Amino acid sequence: MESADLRALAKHLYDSYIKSFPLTKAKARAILTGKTKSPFVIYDMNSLMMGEDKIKFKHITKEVAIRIFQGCQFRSVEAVQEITEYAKSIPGFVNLDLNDQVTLLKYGVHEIIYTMLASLMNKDGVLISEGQGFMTREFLKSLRKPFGDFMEPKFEFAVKFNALELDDSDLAIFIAVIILSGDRPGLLNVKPIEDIQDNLLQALELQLKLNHPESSQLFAKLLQKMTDLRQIVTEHVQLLQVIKKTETLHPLLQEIYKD
Amino acid sequence: HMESADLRALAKHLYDSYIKSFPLTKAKARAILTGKTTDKSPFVIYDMNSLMMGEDKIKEVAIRIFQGCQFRSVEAVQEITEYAKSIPGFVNLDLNDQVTLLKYGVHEIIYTMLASLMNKDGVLISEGQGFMTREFLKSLRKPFGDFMEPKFEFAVKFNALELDDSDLAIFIAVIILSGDRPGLLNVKPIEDIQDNLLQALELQLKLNHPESSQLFAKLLQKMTDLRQIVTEHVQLLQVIKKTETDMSLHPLLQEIYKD
Ligand SMILES: CS(=O)(=O)c1ccc(COc2cc(C(=O)O)ccc2-c2nn(C(=O)c3c(Cl)cccc3C(F)(F)F)c3ccc(Cl)cc23)cc1
Numbered sequence: 001m002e003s004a005d006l007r008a009l010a011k012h013l014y015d016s017y018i019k020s021f022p023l024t025k026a027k028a029r030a031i032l033t034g035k036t037k038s039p040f041v042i043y044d045m046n047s048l049m050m051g052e053d054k055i056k057f058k059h060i061t062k063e064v065a066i067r068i069f070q071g072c073q074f075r076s077v078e079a080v081q082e083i084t085e086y087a088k089s090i091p092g093f094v095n096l097d098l099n100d101q102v103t104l105l106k107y108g109v110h111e112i113i114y115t116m117l118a119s120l121m122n123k124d125g126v127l128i129s130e131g132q133g134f135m136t137r138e139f140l141k142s143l144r145k146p147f148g149d150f151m152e153p154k155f156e157f158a159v160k161f162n163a164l165e166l167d168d169s170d171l172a173i174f175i176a177v178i179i180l181s182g183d184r185p186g187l188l189n190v191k192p193i194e195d196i197q198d199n200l201l202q203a204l205e206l207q208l209k210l211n212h213p214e215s216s217q218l219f220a221k222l223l224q225k226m227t228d229l230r231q232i233v234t235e236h237v238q239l240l241q242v243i244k245k246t247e248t249l250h251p252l253l254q255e256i257y258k259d
Numbered sequence: 260h261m262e263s264a265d266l267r268a269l270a271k272h273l274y275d276s277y278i279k280s281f282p283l284t285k286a287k288a289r290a291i292l293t294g295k296t297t298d299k300s301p302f303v304i305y306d307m308n309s310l311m312m313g314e315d316k317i318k319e320v321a322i323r324i325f326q327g328c329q330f331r332s333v334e335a336v337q338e339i340t341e342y343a344k345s346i347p348g349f350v351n352l353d354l355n356d357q358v359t360l361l362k363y364g365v366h367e368i369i370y371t372m373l374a375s376l377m378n379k380d381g382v383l384i385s386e387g388q389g390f391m392t393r394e395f396l397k398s399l400r401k402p403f404g405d406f407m408e409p410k411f412e413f414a415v416k417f418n419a420l421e422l423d424d425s426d427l428a429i430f431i432a433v434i435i436l437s438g439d440r441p442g443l444l445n446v447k448p449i450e451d452i453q454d455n456l457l458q459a460l461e462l463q464l465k466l467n468h469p470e471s472s473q474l475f476a477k478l479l480q481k482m483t484d485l486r487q488i489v490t491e492h493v494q495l496l497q498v499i500k501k502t503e504t505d506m507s508l509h510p511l512l513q514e515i516y517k518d
């Protein structure tokens with residue numbers, strides 16, 4: 001692969017990335033820093049009870065920490081259809097065996113949600129509703145019994161991840177790399193998936209050297225994050241499993257949020 | 260007004276979710292029913308002697324058949340639910356509108372998709388391994404005999420249109436997104452999505468059945484009939500319940516009906 005072909009693959013994903021996802025990282029960083037119609041801030045129970053009436057949330061039908069929990073699930077399901085659509089533009093993806101496509105997404109969406117969620121997060125809280133809102137980390141971390149400790153590990157990850165200082169052109173490729181993992185359980189034909197990931201890895205390597213020439217071994221250091229990424233996704237589901245056996249939904253709803 | 264290229268994209272997107280969400284396609288089901296094959300060959304159930312043997316093979320009578328359908332309907336509801344999540348726009352509607360669209364739309368879609376498993380003489384069962392003759396079901400006792408046949412009756416008429424899975428994937432999507440369901444909160448954005456699916460359905464049919472005079476018009480007129488048979492169906496279940504008190508329904512099905 002000559003440099004000309006990789007740079008082309010980079011723009012192809014960067015362009016598709018911009019179209020697929022509602023709030024890019026460049027906009028979210030301008031909002032958080034304060035360089036841009038301020039977001040409505042959620043810092044306690046009373047302000048959330050206001051933000052729902054104001055910034056009318058679509059997941060509203062209930063106890064406070066549960067409602068926060070379920071609004072996240074609503075946003076996750078949405079992001080899953082967003083990532084699914086982005087995958088279709090990864091050169092090669094739509095030519096995979098259809099079962100391999102379903103498998104790659106089934107297993108990759110949590111690591112990619114966790115990743116892109118770092119784009120909307122800083123030390124102190126997280127952007128919501130396409131940047132219209134801001135929910136403080138102090139508030140999320142303070143929620144009761146299980147719900148408090150379910151929220152904080154996200155902020156903890158994102159603070160470490162954001163130290164890498166990636167932008168949207170870096171992330172468009174890094175995301176494509178996650179999807180095309182050849183070690184997902186039960187793939188039928190691994191070779192062409194590794195073939196594509198070897199191509200994206202090549203595109204990721206070059207992008208980083210061009211876009212961060214002063215950041216020694218940034219490529220290696222981001223690949224070690226995918227190590228870290230495997231751990232929080234496991235933690236996550238073993239924390240989901242625990243919520244269910246204690247806390248609470250409508251049978252039709254349960255099918256949507258299944259898995 | 261969407262550009263032709265954008266619509267055709269929507270068709271391919273939906274056909275692809277259809278192949279992925281539903282296990283027994285219509286193309287496969289017509290391959291079994293036609294026959295001419297040795298491996299794709301159903302065990303036929305036409306009486307009790309055949310029923311007692313197929314259980315070993317395919318692995319009171321009318322009750323167990325009644326119960327087998329409901330277990331199978333629950334499965335189809337989970338399959339349709341997963342399909343709904345990929346209809347572009349669906350997961351972004353008001354959550355209660357989502358439940359409403361599904362609550363009313365699943366029966367209309369099972370009946371449509373059950374016609375794929377049907378010819379004048381019977382129905383595939385157990386993912387195509389089995390086949391149950393219409394005559395036998397029609398011969399079941401008390402109320403249960405007349406419970407099975409109206410499916411065959413609608414299905415023979417519907418299948419005369421000769422649609423394939425690329426046509427049905429869109430027609431199914433159009434059904435889910437009906438803005439005239441009881442109790443929707445935001446009718447406008449549901450219609451907005453349905454106008455695009457209608458647009459996508461018209462073109463697909465005009466291209467895939469160019470020798471079919473007014474196939475689009477005739478196919479929308481089938482949505483008339485479907486509305487009636489769900490009424491008939493739920494009113495015959497209600498009557499069976501006041502007769503067969505042993506019998507229990509599935510909570511997910513139980514939730515859909517109470518409406
Ligand atoms: C209380 S509200 O209704 O006003 C409310 C609405 C919206 C949010 C923002 O949340 C997210 C936004 C995007 C996005 O914009 O791309 C992506 C993810 C989340 C989010 N997912 N998530 C999970 O638990 C989770 C995760 Cl990580 C991975 C997979 C599945 C899940 C699931 F399914 F369990 F949900 C969070 C936990 C904490 C926080 Cl802080 C955010 C998230 C917050 C509050």
Ligand SMILES: CS(=O)(=O)c1ccc(COc2cc(C(=O)O)ccc2-c2nn(C(=O)c3c(Cl)cccc3C(F)(F)F)c3ccc(Cl)cc23)cc1
Pocket residue numbers: 323324325326327328329330331332335366369370372373376382383384385391396406407408410411496512
């Ligand atoms: C005796 S068995 O266990 O081997 C057995 C298993 C499976 C069948 C096939 O049946 C179906 C298969 C599929 C499918 O494959 O997608 C889809 C639907 C039905 C089916 N549902 N149904 C109902 O009454 C019904 C319906 Cl439509 C909608 C909602 C709820 C119900 C419920 F709950 F009231 F039941 C039928 C009635 C007659 C016939 Cl002919 C078929 C069906 C047959 C035998």
